Amino acid sequence: TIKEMPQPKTFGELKNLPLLNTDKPVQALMKIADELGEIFKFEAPGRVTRYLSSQRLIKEACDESRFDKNLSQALKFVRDFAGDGLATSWTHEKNWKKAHNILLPSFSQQAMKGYHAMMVDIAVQLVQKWERLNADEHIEVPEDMTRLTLDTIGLCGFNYRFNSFYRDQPHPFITSMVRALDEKMDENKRQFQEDIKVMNDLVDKIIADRKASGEQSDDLLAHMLNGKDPETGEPLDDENIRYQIITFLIAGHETTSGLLSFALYFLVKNPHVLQKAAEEAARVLVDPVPSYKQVKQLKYVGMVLNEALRLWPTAPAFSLYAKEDTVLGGEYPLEKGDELMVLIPQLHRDKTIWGDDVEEFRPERFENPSAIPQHAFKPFGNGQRACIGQQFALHEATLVLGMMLKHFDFEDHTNYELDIKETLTLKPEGFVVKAKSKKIPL
Ligand code: HEM
Ligand SMILES: C=Cc1ccccc1
Ligand SMILES: [Cl-]
Numbered sequence: 001t002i003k004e005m006p007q008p009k010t011f012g013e014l015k016n017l018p019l020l021n022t023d024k025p026v027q028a029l030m031k032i033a034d035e036l037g038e039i040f041k042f043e044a045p046g047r048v049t050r051y052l053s054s055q056r057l058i059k060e061a062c063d064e065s066r067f068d069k070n071l072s073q074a075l076k077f078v079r080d081f082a083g084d085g086l087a088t089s090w091t092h093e094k095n096w097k098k099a100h101n102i103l104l105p106s107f108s109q110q111a112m113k114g115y116h117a118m119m120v121d122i123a124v125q126l127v128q129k130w131e132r133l134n135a136d137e138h139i140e141v142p143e144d145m146t147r148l149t150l151d152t153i154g155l156c157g158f159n160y161r162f163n164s165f166y167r168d169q170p171h172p173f174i175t176s177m178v179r180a181l182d183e184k185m186d187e188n189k190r191q192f193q194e195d196i197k198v199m200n201d202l203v204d205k206i207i208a209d210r211k212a213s214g215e216q217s218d219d220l221l222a223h224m225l226n227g228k229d230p231e232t233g234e235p236l237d238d239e240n241i242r243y244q245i246i247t248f249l250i251a252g253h254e255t256t257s258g259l260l261s262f263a264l265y266f267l268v269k270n271p272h273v274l275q276k277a278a279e280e281a282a283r284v285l286v287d288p289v290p291s292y293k294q295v296k297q298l299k300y301v302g303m304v305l306n307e308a309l310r311l312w313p314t315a316p317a318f319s320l321y322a323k324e325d326t327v328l329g330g331e332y333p334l335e336k337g338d339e340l341m342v343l344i345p346q347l348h349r350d351k352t353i354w355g356d357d358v359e360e361f362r363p364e365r366f367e368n369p370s371a372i373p374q375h376a377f378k379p380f381g382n383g384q385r386a387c388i389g390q391q392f393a394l395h396e397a398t399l400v401l402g403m404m405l406k407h408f409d410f411e412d413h414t415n416y417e418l419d420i421k422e423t424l425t426l427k428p429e430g431f432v433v434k435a436k437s438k439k440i441p442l
Contacts, residue, residue, distance in 0.1 A: 003331040005050060006036040007043070015043040024422050026316045026345065033346045039332065042341075049319070049339040050332075053346035055353050057329050059375035061340050062382045066326050068092075069385040070319035070339050074424060081181065081199070084240060085247030091385060094232075095240050100384070102227040102236060103244070106220045107391055114218060115156040115392065116292045116399075122152045123400045124289070124442060125165045127407050130435050138413060141431040145260040146253065150174070152396050153252030157220035158206050158245070173202055177250065203245045220248060248389075254425045256393045258314030259305060263401060265428050266308050266361045268412040273363060274405075277304050281405035288442050290399055298402045303363035305397050309379035310354075311361065313344040314425050318381050344378055408435040 011018045019042075022028050029051060032040060038054035052058050061067050068091050071079065079088040086103065089096040105111065126148050130139060147164035150171070154160040162171050176198035183192040210221055224241045228234065236244065267274040280300045287294070320340045327333050328340075349358040353376045354365065380387035387393070404410075411434040421429035 001331075002333060005039055005041045005332060007041045008032045008036060010043075013045065015045065017044040020044075024420065026343075026422055026426070027420060029343055030346055033343060039329075049341050050334075051341050051343050053343050053350070055347060055350045055373060055376045058342055058347050058378065059373075060328055061320055061342060062375045062378070064383045066323060067320040067340065068323055070321040072317070072319040072341070075319075077181070077184070078424070080184070081177075082247045082250070083243035085243035086388060087247050087251050095236070098229045098232055098234060099236060099240060099244060100388070101229040101231055103220070103223055103388060105227070106223045107388055111218070112391055112395055113292050116295075116395070118156045119152055119396050119399050120289050122148055122155060123403050125151070126400065127403055127442060129165055130408060131437055133435075136434070138432050138434045141264055141433060142257060142261040142427045142429070145257040148400060149253035149256040149260070149396070150249075152256075153249060156392075157248055157252060159210070159217065159219060159221070160206055172198055173249075199246065202249075203242050206245055207241070221245070250424075252389060252392070254423070255314040256397060258312070258425045258427045259308060259393065260397055260400065261427050261431055262312045262314070263304055263308040263397070264404070264410070264433065265416070265418065265431055266311070267304065267405075268410050268416075268433060270361050273304065273361060274410070277301055277363075277401075278405045281402045285402055285406045290402060295395060295399045295402065298398050300363060301398050301402050301405070302394065303366040305394060305401065306366045306377070306379075307361055307363040310348045310365070310377065311345070311359075312420070312426055313348065313379035314427070315379070315381070315387075316344050316426055318342050318344070342378065342382075347376070347378060350376070404435075407438055407440055409438065410435050 008016060008019060010016060019025075019028060019032070033051065033053045038052065038057055040051050042049050042051055052061055071088065071090065075088050082088045084093050084095045086096070086099055089099075091097075126144065129144070133139070147167075151162050151164045154162045162173070164171060176195035180192050180195040180199070183195075206221065207225075210217070210225065224236055224244050226235070267277060277300055280298060284294055284297050318341070320342070322334045322336055322338045322340075325333070325335050334340075348354075351358055353373060375382075380390045413434045414432055416428075416431055416433075419429045420426050
């Protein structure tokens with residue numbers, strides 16, 4: 001029997017559109033969800049979508065025979081730069097499945113072992129930076145985590161060194177990336193087009209240096225350049241290879257920087273959790289450099305990372321459309337092409353799944369993950385359109401956080417007040433700490 005969806009306050013002909021005129025629209029959508037419940041309609045001139053918050057409804061929306069990935073307004077904009085790269089292609093575009101099949105083997109267990117030494121190269125630069133600070137100096141947490149994650153995808157994925165740790169100023173790639181993208185929220189056209197040229201010359205250099213190289217390679221770039229899809233039998237064409245390089249250099253670092261920064265925020269705010277994870281790191285990381293196998297034994301560090309993704313998943317929403325007319329939850333009829341948005345932070349606060357203490361930071365929720373019902377925990381998206389870089393993000397973050405907890409004690413010296421900046425990702429803006437060295441050599 002059919003139900004009418006709640007809707008938040010309207011503004012005449014503008015409908016709900018003005019609720020999004022805020023620098024924190026995900027946070028404002030979470031509040032609407034606390035007020036309206038598991039589903040609400042959100043209308044704008046010429047548009048409608050439905051925001052989902054409960055596991056009981058999201059488990060249906062994750063049914064791939066009924067719903068496929070939709071390009072959100074944001075992906076539609078990013079598409080101007082990332083083209084039909086993995087993240088911004090429709091599932092039905094030839095190049096989505098070709099590139100999925102060609103690039104999947106770049107995240108196999110054997111590929112992950114291949115990347116480990118270069119992840120260590122970066123993680124050691126981070127540890128050295130902090131070792132080298134003078135007394136009383138502090139650390140800008142998301143700034144340094146972005147330094148780490150950017151350098152990690154450039155080097156592991158492309159054998160390119162952004163050398164972020166030699167810079168106190170942004171890398172010309174990144175800031176060009178940002179102001180070209182903003183320059184479609186006279187003159188700022190030699191400027192926007194200076195930037196696009198920055199992006200294009202970097203992609204050009206990545207490709208050309210690989211070709212001029214006589215070294216054998218099995219990294220991500222090697223797959224883009226040489227791999228053949230077993231289905232079509234075809235390799236990627238030059239145009240799509242370019243889009244994939246841009247896709248992975250951005251998707252491959254921003255969300256991972258967020259996760260690291262929230263995890264450390266939650267550790268400093270919960271000193272018993274911090275002590276338990278530091279104890280694990282001291283017990284397990286018995287050598288000067290961690291090995292692949294040692295990172296795999298950092299069980300509790302990995303539970304910390306999942307509990308940080310539970311509360312602040314750093315790609316906080318994904319969009320879907322109905323493949324055919326269908327009824328959601330036995331209550332809401334949908335027509336072919338109708339859109340749904342999955343509000344992941346709210347899914348992750350569903351008290352029917354997690355119990356009443358949902359706001360508490362408790363990594364022990366992840367002790368027995370087979371206990372979690374289907375579709376309840378979704379920081380990496382859904383189905384065949386789920387994050388292809390999941391294992392890469394979690395290996396890098398477990399390695400790096402384990403090393404941080406081995407080498408330093410941390411102080412929340414400002415009593416930092418959580419302030420979450422929203423871009424394509426989320427981060428704790430302005431988060432700073434002091435790190436006192438434990439004086440353990442590398
Ligand atoms: C903790 C860090 C990360 C988070 C939370 C995350 C989250 C997500 C989510 C939610 C999606 C689905 C997007 C949608 O449905 O519209 C996705 C897709 C994707 N991610 Fe990640 N991601 C992370 C790290 C990475 C890394 C390190 C890489 C690359 C190495 C990456 C590459 C991609 C790509 C290429 C897709 C598109 C996959 C496809 O549709 O075929 N991500 N991610
Ligand atoms: C970092 C992976 C990703 C890809 C698309 C949207 C948000 C995050
Ligand atoms: Cl529990």
